[PDB]
Amino acid sequence: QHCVKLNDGHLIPALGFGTYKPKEVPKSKSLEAACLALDVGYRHVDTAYAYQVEEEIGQAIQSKIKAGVVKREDLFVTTKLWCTCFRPELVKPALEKSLKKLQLDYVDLYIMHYPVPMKSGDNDFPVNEQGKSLLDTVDFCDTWERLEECKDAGLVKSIGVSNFNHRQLERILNKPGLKYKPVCNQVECHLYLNQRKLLDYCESKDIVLVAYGALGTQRYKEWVDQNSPVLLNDPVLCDVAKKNKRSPALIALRYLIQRGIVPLAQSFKENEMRENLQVFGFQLSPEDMKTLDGLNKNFRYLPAEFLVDHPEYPFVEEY
Numbered sequence: 361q362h363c364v365k366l367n368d369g370h371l372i373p374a375l376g377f378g379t380y381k382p383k384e385v386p387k388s389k390s391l392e393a394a395c396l397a398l399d400v401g402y403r404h405v406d407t408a409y410a411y412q413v414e415e416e417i418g419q420a421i422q423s424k425i426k427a428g429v430v431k432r433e434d435l436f437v438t439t440k441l442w443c444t445c446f447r448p449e450l451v452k453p454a455l456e457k458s459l460k461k462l463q464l465d466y467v468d469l470y471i472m473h474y475p476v477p478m479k480s481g482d483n484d485f486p487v488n489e490q491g492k493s494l495l496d497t498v499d500f501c502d503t504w505e506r507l508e509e510c511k512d513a514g515l516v517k518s519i520g521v522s523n524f525n526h527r528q529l530e531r532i533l534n535k536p537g538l539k540y541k542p543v544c545n546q547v548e549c550h551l552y553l554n555q556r557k558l559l560d561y562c563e564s565k566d567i568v569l570v571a572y573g574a575l576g577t578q579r580y581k582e583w584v585d586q587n588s589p590v591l592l593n594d595p596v597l598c599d600v601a602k603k604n605k606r607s608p609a610l611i612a613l614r615y616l617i618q619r620g621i622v623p624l625a626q627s628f629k630e631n632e633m634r635e636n637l638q639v640f641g642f643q644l645s646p647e648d649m650k651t652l653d654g655l656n657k658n659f660r661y662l663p664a665e666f667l668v669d670h671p672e673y674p675f676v677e678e679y
């Protein structure tokens with residue numbers, strides 16, 4: 361398996377399958393796609409409490425284990441603690457809920473989805489009558505301490521974070537009494553937001569950057585501005601793709617791979633799922649990597665504007 365070593369010694373497959381379910385996409389479609397992904401050969405599956413599909417991911421995994429397609433030990437399952445569950449007393453029960461949905465005894469990786477907490481409750485996106493998000497005040501170091509307890513309980517193999525900036529990572533890392541460092545920071549990262557400064561920081565601290573939106577996202581309009589540029593139609597990308605005899609998607613993934621990043625790739629289409637697994641079969645030259653570095657625009661498809669009115673909103677800082 362093409363894997364990257366985490367700072368706790370665990371191995372993460374270097375390409376993961378994404379499972380965000382758009383608002384209009386039925387759960388049955390998420391289930392089918394996850395089943396197919398396992399047949400196609402994906403081993404790393406990335407999901408989240410807030411995606412509403414852990415049950416479907418759990419069904420896909422157990423049905424494919426029962427059929428002999430895969431064994432649990434062959435899979436790397438990530439899920440994410442949602443903002444409404446950051447209060448320390450809610451963390452382990454939220455993980456236990458997710459494990460039940462997933463039909464798993466443990467997950468391979470459990471991460472804080474953002475550094476910003478939200479009002480606790482069943483609603484994942486609590487708002488007032490004006491539609492303003494109801495946020496909360498909870499030190500992410502206090503949430504982190506409970507993730508450490510989850511790991512010590514054997515409910516999760518590795519723990520990490522998502523959508524943290526370098527100051528926020530520093531706060532965890534420099535906290536007196538810290539037990540375990542985050543193994544990863546999962547962030548938006550792609551040719552238009554190449555994260556070079558955050559990447560260099562993470563490398564210096566032995567933290568792996570896991571890239572979502574690696575292909576420019578599925579462009580689900582609940583979260584992604586419809587006027588955003590279409591990464592896979594970029595002219596420089598398409599020229600590099602033609603020169604290398606690979607698809608634009610494969611170039612965009614390989615770019616990240618060669619920088620030590622673990623990209624996620626989502627598709628519902630079988631041949632796209634199949635093609636993305638080809639990313640370990642070719643290499644990009646230093647000249648083409650230089651060309652691809654030139655595409656950075658500091659452009660975020662997923663700015664999480666619903667979290668903006670909070671001092672831990674992560675994306676104001678330079679990196």
Ligand SMILES: NC(=O)c1ccc[n+]([C@@H]2O[C@H](COP(=O)([O-])OP(=O)(O)OC[C@H]3O[C@@H](n4cnc5c(N)ncnc54)[C@H](O)[C@@H]3O)[C@@H](O)[C@H]2O)c1
Pocket residue numbers: 377378379380406407473522523546547571572573574575576577578579592607609610624625626627628631632633635636662
């Ligand atoms: N941690 C976070 O805050 C966070 C937030 C959002 C999503 N995610 C995760 O990131 C995953 C990836 O993000 P995403 O789902 O938005 O999409 P993505 O960037 O992987 O984009 C998927 C799009 O790429 C296209 N595509 C895929 N393979 C292709 C191929 N070989 N050729 C041509 N086109 C191809 C498809 O059209 C698809 O709609 C999610 O599914 C989810 O698991 C994480």
